[model samples]
Target: EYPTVSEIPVGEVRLYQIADGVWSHIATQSFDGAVYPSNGLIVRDGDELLLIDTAWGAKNTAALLAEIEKQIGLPVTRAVSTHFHDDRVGGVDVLRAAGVATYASPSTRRLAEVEGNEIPTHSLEGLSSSGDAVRFGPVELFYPGAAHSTDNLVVYVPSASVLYGGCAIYELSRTSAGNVADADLAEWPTSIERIQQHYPEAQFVIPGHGLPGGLDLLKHTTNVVKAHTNR
Candidate 1:
């Protein structure tokens, strides 16, 4: 079934299940609209909710927030950035203002702080381990790192067996640079491989800017990106 932009009512937790679970704002569009569209994921667990990526500009993000409210009335317990790309990390402030804990890999934090001045980093504490659980009623976060971006991370909803893949792996035979000067072409494969190994049971995978896919798609994406190293 095609996923809605937002507003899916299912029990206390409404899953937004967006195309891109991570993105920051890009003042410039380099892809000429060819790249994956930035997407997000909203998960409501009891009285708490979490937004994966705040996404681009405030207007679009605010619009998403409004739409999310239509489905569930829960405070955002946390906001996770898939990577340090401007389109993925741009919305940290928006989430923080709402009293949500913003989390990202340490590498992501460094790049945002030292490299991308245009993008802002958050002080929100993050997971001690990829397997560590961030309790917001019933959601959990799993880390499979050093891929896509050096700071790339993934969130897992064990109940749904859904893995929010962030920018770690694009299911298509595609390639693009991150917000930083370049992507981690070398580690990208190994990192995602680790994620797959740990979450072998993941039934659905969400990309940072595309439709959710199956496990095979993730493996294929990893191969596609790895192809860049030889080329």
Candidate 2:
């Protein structure tokens, strides 16, 4: 059941441990303009919280924060975008102002300063950064490299054995024919391959958009690429 911000179970600092979390919220349109709803996730570790991707705009960001607060109080320790896309990073400012130690990939840090900041970094009032996982069940900041957006970092919650794929691996439902073009298609497959290789036994895989799924999501994405590559 999708809980609203007011009903996040604010008692024991509950960290629902969703597949990955939710979506960014503004991905109604793919780069090719295929309309769809974006999804992101939230992770809580101890007293601190780690937001995977900020949402589409200010409204979505606020909604996400409220939902998180309802369940785990306020003060998100860190905020990281799966990529530099508008749907993903637009809420950085809001997160920063709320005192979240916002972060991005090293390259994304540069991208943020150069382009992302221009969107809402100052308004959200959060600070952009590059580093390891701040809080969450267990901190393991995936690998180091430019896979999805040259600055994507998947958070691995050891206790749950779940991996937030970000955009490196979009959810199964969101996978479509015209979507791969806007992404770094060339790098996406290898990145997913590596991600699967790293977390082969992941019980759940939460993607950047759409609902969470099992290993089938990974296979579906890979197979889509393979079909394209062979043609």
Candidate 3:
């Protein structure tokens, strides 16, 4: 059974048990006066909790945390920001204030600094411009180069065979790229291809926004980006 969905101060919050130890928080927040939903993952192993991305802001983060505590009964011990965008890292300060050890790619950290947002507590090392994979507990962080943002990252749970394709990949319902203010159009398709080749076994794929679906979302994202770039 799915967890009870709630209408929180931030937006709608729905928790789905994607795997035995993995959950995805589907939270929506209004950005630039429009409702923009985003996806993040929670991976719990024993007493340890790992957060993939923070919600919109401090208030939303708090609400999400409260709900998490109520549902999972464990505090988030660590977190990783998929990118520097507010939608991705907006609640970073809140998490940091709670003393959560936050991590982000080097480029994400740098961009957050430039944007005057809260910098992550830790900057990930060894993320390759080509492609590099790093492990944090049961979650795997893969950098397939720039796509949605210069520092975009995709998270994979080996135990779940689930891939969290943060903003770099859009949900299949999106016919066009939603936000590209900092996107690398030329490298977008290549990055998608790299991720596809890297995680062929991913059974469930969650986008940074919208609904979660199967591996076909990967192909849909590539086709969408290609069509947009071609026109």
Q: Please list the C-alpha lDDT of all candidates, in the order they appear.
A: 0.58, 0.58, 0.84
Q: Provide the lowest-lDDT 10-residue window in model 3.
A: 1-10
Best by lDDT: 3
Taking all chains together, the TM-score of candidate 3 against the true structure is 0.94
Per-residue lDDT tens digits of candidate 3, residues 11-116?
Answer: 5466778889899886777677766667789998569799999876777787778878889888798999999988778888889888789999888999999998
| Runs with alpha carbons beyond 4 Å of true place in candidate 2 | 1-35, 116-137, 144-147, 175-182, 229-231
Segments in model 1 whose C-alpha atoms lie over 4 Å from true places: 1-35, 117-137, 173-180
- The better candidate by lDDT, 1 or 3, is 3
TM-score rank, highest first? 3, 1, 2
TM-score of 2: 0.73
Question: Candidate 1: RMSD over Cα atoms?
Answer: 6.3
Model 3 clash count equals 0
lDDT of 2: 0.58
Q: Write the residue-wise lDDT of candidate 1 on 45-122 in tens digits.
A: 556766676655444555555556674555667776666676666657766666677776566677777765224344
Better of 2 and 3 by TM-score: 3
Ten residues in sequence with the least summed lDDT for candidate 1: 21-30
